[PDB]
A paper describes a structure:
Many of these proteins are members of the Per-ARNT-Sim (PAS) family of ligand-controlled protein/protein interaction domains, which often internally bind different small molecule cofactors to sensitize them to environmental factors like O_2_, light, and xenobiotics. Changes to the occupancies or configurations of these cofactors trigger conformational changes in the surrounding protein, regulating the activity of various effector domains in natural and engineered proteins. To test this prediction, we evaluated how ligand binding affects the PAS-B domains of the human HIF-2*α* and ARNT proteins, both of which are involved in the human hypoxia response and contain internal cavities known to bind artificial small molecule ligands. We used the same approach with the ARNT PAS-B domain, which has the same fold as HIF-2*α* PAS-B but contains smaller internal cavities totaling 150 Å^3^ in volume.
We have previously used NMR-based fragment screening, isothermal titration calorimetry (ITC) and microscale thermophoresis (MST) to identify several compounds which bind ARNT PAS-B with micromolar affinities; two of these, KG-548 and KG-655, are further known to disrupt ARNT PAS-B interactions with coactivator proteins. However, the binding modes of these compounds remained unclear without NMR or X-ray co-complex structures available at the outset of this work. To gain more insight on how KG-548 and KG-655 bound ARNT PAS-B, we used our pressure NMR analysis, confirming that ARNT PAS-B retains a flexibly-accessible interior cavity with a stdev(c*_i_* [^15^N]) of 84 x (2×10^-10^ ppm/bar^2^) (**[Fig fig4], S5**). Repeating these in the presence of the KG-655 ligand, we observed a drop of a stdev(c*_i_*[^15^N]) to 51 x (2×10^-10^ ppm/bar^2^), consistent with an interior binding location for this small ligand analogous to the HIF-2*α* PAS-B examples above. However, similar studies with the larger KG-548 ligand show a stdev(c*_i_* [^15^N]) comparable to the apo protein, with an observed value of 96 x (2×10^-10^ ppm/bar^2^) that suggests that this compound binds in a different mode than KG-655, potentially outside the cavity. We subsequently verified this external binding mode for KG-548 by determining the X-ray crystal structure of ARNT PAS-B with this ligand soaked into the crystal (**Table S2**). Finally, our comparison of the ARNT PAS-B binding compounds KG-548 and KG-655 provided an outstanding example of the power of the pressure NMR method to quickly and accurately provide mode-of-action binding site information even with limited structural data available. In these cases, high pressure NMR – using rapidly-acquired spectra without needing any chemical shift assignments – indicated different binding modes between the two ligands, with KG-655 binding primarily to an internal site while KG-548 bound externally.
Residue numbers in the entry:
A (entry chain B): 360 to 465
B (entry chain A): 361 to 465
The structure:
C-alpha cells in the first residue's frame, strides 16, 4: 500500500478515510476523521496546502496535485503527494466534497 | 496514468473523474450508467465480477484486480483497479464501491 483516499469538506476536514491510511501514515481512520488535514501539515507547508484547497474548488472537477510534509503517527514528517478534485451533482449548485488521493513519496 | 470511479455494488459507473479521458479514451459521459464489466475482455469478466462480490465482503479493505479494458479506440488496455467499499463515518451501510484505475503498461 502506497496511498489512501480521503473525502474532505470544503475547509479540509476529513469526512472519510480508507483503511490504507494505517499503512501509509500510521493512523487508524478514527484518528483522522473530523480533523482538518492542515492540522497534520508541517507549518511551513500549511499555506501551500490551504491555497491548493482554494484552487481545486475553482478548477471544477479538474485535478490539482500538491506536495507537503504530513505528520505520521510516530511523529516523523512524511513527504506526501495529494491529488485533489471536487465532487458535485447536477440537482445541486453546491460543490459537496473534495476527493484526495494521498500518496507517500519517499 | 489513473482516475477514480465510483460504482454501485454490481459495477455500474456512477461517477468517473475527468482523467478517464487520457487513461481510457472515453469522456465520463461515455461510461456513466454502464457496467465496467461491459468494457472488460470476456476472459477477465468473471474475475472482475468476483472482485465486486469480494470487495463488499472485505468491508472497507482494499482488493486489487487486473483486467483488460476496451479503450475508446478499440484496443485492450491492461488495467489495475484497487477497490474498496465506502460508507459514511461510524455508519454501517455500504453505499458505493470506490475504484482507483491505473493503466499498467
Ligand atoms: F472518498 C471516497 F470515499 F473515496 C469517495 C466518496 C464519494 C461520495 N461521498 N458521498 N457520495 N459519494 C465519492 C467519491 C468519488 F469521487 F469517487 F466519486 C469518492
Amino acid at each position: 500500500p502506497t496511498e489512501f483516499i480521503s473525502r474532505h469538506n470544503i475547509e479540509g476536514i476529513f469526512t472519510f478515510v480508507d483503511h490504507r491510511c494505517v499503512a501509509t501514515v500510521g493512523y487508524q481512520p478514527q484518528e483522522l476523521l473530523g480533523k482538518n488535514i492542515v492540522e497534520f501539515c508541517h507549518p511551513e507547508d500549511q499555506q501551500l496546502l490551504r491555497d491548493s484547497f482554494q484552487q481545486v474548488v475553482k478548477l471544477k472537477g479538474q485535478v490539482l496535485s500538491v506536495m507537503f510534509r504530513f505528520r505520521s503517527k510516530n511523529q516523523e514528517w512524511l513527504w506526501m503527494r495529494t491529488s485533489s478534485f471536487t465532487f458535485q451533482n447536477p440537482y445541486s449548485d453546491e460543490i459537496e466534497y473534495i476527493i484526495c488521493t494521498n500518496t507517500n513519496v519517499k
